[PDB]
Amino acid sequence: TTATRLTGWGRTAPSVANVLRTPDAEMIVKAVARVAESGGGRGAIARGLGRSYGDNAQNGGGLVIDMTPLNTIHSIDADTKLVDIDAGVNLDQLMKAALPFGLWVPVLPGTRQVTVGGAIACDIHGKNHHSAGSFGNHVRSMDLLTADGEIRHLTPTGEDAELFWATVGGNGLTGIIMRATIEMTPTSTAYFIADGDVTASLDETIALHSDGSEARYTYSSAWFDAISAPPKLGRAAVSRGRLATVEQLPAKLRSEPLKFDELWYRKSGTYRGKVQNLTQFYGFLQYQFVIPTEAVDEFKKIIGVIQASGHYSFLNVFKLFGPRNQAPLSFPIPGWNICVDFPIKDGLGKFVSELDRRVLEFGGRLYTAKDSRTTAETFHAMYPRVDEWISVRRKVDPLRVFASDMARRLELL
Ligand SMILES: Cc1cc2nc3c(=O)[nH]c(=O)nc-3n(C[C@H](O)[C@H](O)[C@H](O)COP(=O)(O)OP(=O)(O)OC[C@H]3O[C@@H](n4cnc5c(N)ncnc54)[C@H](O)[C@@H]3O)c2cc1C
Ligand SMILES: *N(O)c1c(C)c(C(F)(F)F)cc2nc(C3=N[C@H](C(=O)N4CCCC4)CO3)sc12
């Protein structure tokens, strides 16, 4: 092991600890058990490609097990739609291996450079959340390495269904996911057909997302404005699409269907049925929150608060979430989700602390993947069933040999 201080993706909150990089499966197993004996000291935390901005992947003075050397793809079946992978395999890797089977990764985030281990541990969501939900909805079985040195085979139903949905979005505190089986989405091509729309106000963006035209597309998101003053505030560049069928694909592309390789602003944004690949279709404080669908006025308010703030975010992603899964600590809930990132300035930390209160007041929540600064008080209140979740954690890990900086910060230990 090499003693390395580790930060999030946004180069924040360094945590000096040991990095255990090994492809060997049983060398990992021993490290944990040989740690559990001594007792939860600093404990240990699994780490993927470190794409979450938070201190969820960092341990301070403890052990940080790197999962990336354990990246075996065991089997891909095209008939059963099943994929059996080690937790250390990434999505870019998996997406490339699945296409020759005519299979697509069920949930894709922004960057594909995320591991399966980290994908479940955050219960990550994508552009098709309104149609497919989060990543945990597609996990069929996990092989979790618990605290006592044993490995438990978990599933959505039956035994360990309680521990399963705890690991889904459990930020790696329940254990170390070693091996996962994923349900895949079948596909005829590796392309998308998209409909482009440009709104001129927040009211348009909301109406467009609520008039039921969303039921026409599987994938959808919106590049929106949070700087411009009302009524220009909230105006969005919407990108809504669907997986392309072999028939829909232009004459040249059909040959290799599964291969991988202010007026001006409005008209360029507006189009219909346009065929485009995955790449085309897809210092600073990153901030993400969701607000329940029925609380639309309160949402209109937060955007205005952001507008008047004196803080100017330009990278602004807008999304309407679909139904939630049954995971206690899953971030997504049916509502208006938006991410913003601000430039670090004076009074930012206190302003976002007011957005915490404001978001909490309307029954929404923040995403653990992007959080490094919300309090334990705010987090716990944002997540009902957090107590339920903790009572499960004490059964599986009663020594606190699984602990990250976040778990200490949010008192989830
Ligand atoms: C540019 C960019 C865009 C993004 N877009 C999105 C998006 O649209 N939607 C979205 O939901 N997220 C998004 N993310 C965040 C990212 O998808 C998640 O935070 C993801 O979980 C990080 O994966 P990772 O492998 O890097 O895990 P890490 O960041 O290394 O660790 C995060 C968590 O995963 C856990 N973990 C990792 N491996 C294991 C294992 N084997 N066993 C147990 N626990 C484990 C850790 O305990 C930790 O709590 C984005 C990130 C970036 C940088
Ligand atoms: N918020 O950070 C966020 C959200 C909420 C969503 C979605 F759709 F789930 F609501 C998607 C999403 N995608 C993000 C991202 N896209 C960027 C990207 O790929 N680029 C293309 C142009 C600029 C960079 C990087 O991360 S953030 C995000």
- Please report the DSSP string for 353-410 in residue order: HHHHHHHHHTT-EE-TTT-SS--HHHHHHHSTTHHHHHHHHHHH-SS--B--HHHHHT
CA distance 89 to 72: 7
CA distance 104 to 51: 21
What kind and span of H or E run contains 392?
helix 386-396
- Decide: residue 203, CB within 10 A, 0-12 exposed, 13-18 middle, 19+ buried: middle
The total number of residues written for the chain in this structure: 413
CA distance 313 to 309: 10
Copy the structure tokens of residue 296.
């639309």
**What is the best residue among 221, 333, 341 to mutate for testing ligand 2's pocket, by most ligand atoms within 8 Å of CB?**
221
List, in order, residues 6 or more apart from 72 with CB less than 8 Å away. Answer: 85, 86, 88, 89
Copy the structure tokens of residue 357.
């209160």
Count the neighbouring beta carbons within 10 Å of the beta carbon of residue 143. 18
- Decide: residue 347, CB within 10 A, 0-12 exposed, 13-18 middle, 19+ buried: exposed
- Which of ligand 1's atoms lies nearest the C-alpha of 49? 26
Copy the structure tokens of residue 305.
């608060």
Report whether 201 contacts 234 (CB < 8 A).
Answer: yes
* Residue 100 DSSP symbol: G
Sign of torsion, CA 100 102 107 108? positive
Q: Residue 79: helix, strand or coil by DSSP?
A: coil
Report whether 285 contacts 9 (CB < 8 A).
Answer: no
Peptide linkage before 334 cis (omega within 30 of 0):
no
CA distances from 294 to 204, 210, 297, 366 (A): 17, 11, 8, 18
User: Does 115 appear as a known binding residue?
Assistant: yes
Report whether 1 contacts 18 (CB < 8 A).
Answer: yes
DSSP β-ladder status, 236-243 and 219-224: antiparallel
Phi/psi-derived region of residue 120, left when phi > 0, alpha when psi is between -120 and 50, beta in every other case: alpha
List, in order, residues 6 or more apart from 370 with CB less than 8 Å away. Answer: 52, 53, 54, 286, 287, 288, 339
In terms of Cα–Cα distance, which of 306, 241, 309, 308 is closest to 275? 241
Instruction: Enter the resolution in angstroms.
Output: 3.0
Domain positions in the chain are 1-413
Sequence-ordered strand ranges (E) for 77-226: 82-86, 103-104, 139-145, 151-154, 176-183, 185-186, 191-198, 219-224
In terms of Cα–Cα distance, which of 222, 220, 223, 224 is closest to 240? 220
CA distance 194 to 133: 20
CA distance 214 to 220: 8
In terms of Cα–Cα distance, which of 171, 174, 116, 114 is closest to 144? 174
Report whether 195 contacts 161 (CB < 8 A).
Answer: no
User: Does 5 appear as a known binding residue?
Assistant: no
User: Position of tokens 């999304």?
Assistant: 319
CA distance 105 to 149: 31
Q: Which residues pair with 87 in a beta bridge?
A: none
Ligand 2 pocket member 9 (CB < 6 A): no
Sequence-ordered strand ranges (E) for 174-283: 176-183, 185-186, 191-198, 219-224, 236-243, 271-277
Phi/psi-derived region of residue 402, left when phi > 0, alpha when psi is between -120 and 50, beta in every other case: beta
Report whether 174 contacts 142 (CB < 8 A).
Answer: no
Report whether 170 contacts 121 (CB < 8 A).
Answer: yes
* Residue 362 DSSP symbol: T
| Angle formed by the axes of helices 348-361 and 296-308, nearest 10° | 170
Task: Give me the sheet containing 44-47, strands edge to edge.
Answer: 2-6, 15-21, 63-66, 44-47
Copy the structure tokens of residue 383.
């997540």
Closest residue (by CA) to atom 2 of ligand 2? 339
Closest residue (by CA) to atom 9 of ligand 2? 126
Ligand 2 pocket member 288 (CB < 6 A): yes
What is the whole-number distance in angstroms between the Cα of residue 317 and the centre of ligand 2?
6
CA distance 125 to 176: 21
Find the farthest-apart pair of alpha carbons in the chain and give their distance in angstroms, rounded: 67
User: Position of tokens 């716990």?
Assistant: 380
Q: Residue 85: helix, strand or coil by DSSP?
A: strand
Copy the structure tokens of residue 403.
């602990």
- Tell me the CB-side half-sphere exposure of residue 363, using CA atoms within 13 A: 8
Count the neighbouring beta carbons within 10 Å of the beta carbon of residue 299. 24
Ligand 2 pocket member 167 (CB < 6 A): no
CA distance 26 to 34: 12
Closest residue (by CA) to atom 12 of ligand 2? 110
Sign of torsion, CA 239 241 246 249? negative
Ligand closest to CA 321: 2
Copy the structure tokens of residue 337.
């989700």
Copy the structure tokens of residue 180.
């996962």
Copy the structure tokens of residue 278.
């995955």
CA distance 146 to 334: 32
List, in order, residues 6 or more apart from 371 with CB less than 8 Å away. Answer: 53, 54, 379, 406
Task: Give me the sheet containing 151-154, strands edge to edge.
Answer: 73-76, 82-86, 176-183, 139-145, 151-154
Sign of torsion, CA 23 25 30 33? positive
CA distance 121 to 393: 14
Report how this structure was experimentally obtained. X-ray
Q: Torsions phi, psi of 141, nearest 5? A: -165, 145
In terms of Cα–Cα distance, which of 76, 93, 78, 71 is closest to 25? 71
Report whether 177 contacts 87 (CB < 8 A).
Answer: yes
Report whether 299 contacts 228 (CB < 8 A).
Answer: no
DSSP β-ladder status, 271-277 and 284-292: unpaired
Residues with CB under 6 A from ligand 1: 9, 45-52, 56-57, 67, 87, 109-111, 114-115, 117-119, 121-122, 124-126, 171-172, 176-177, 369, 404
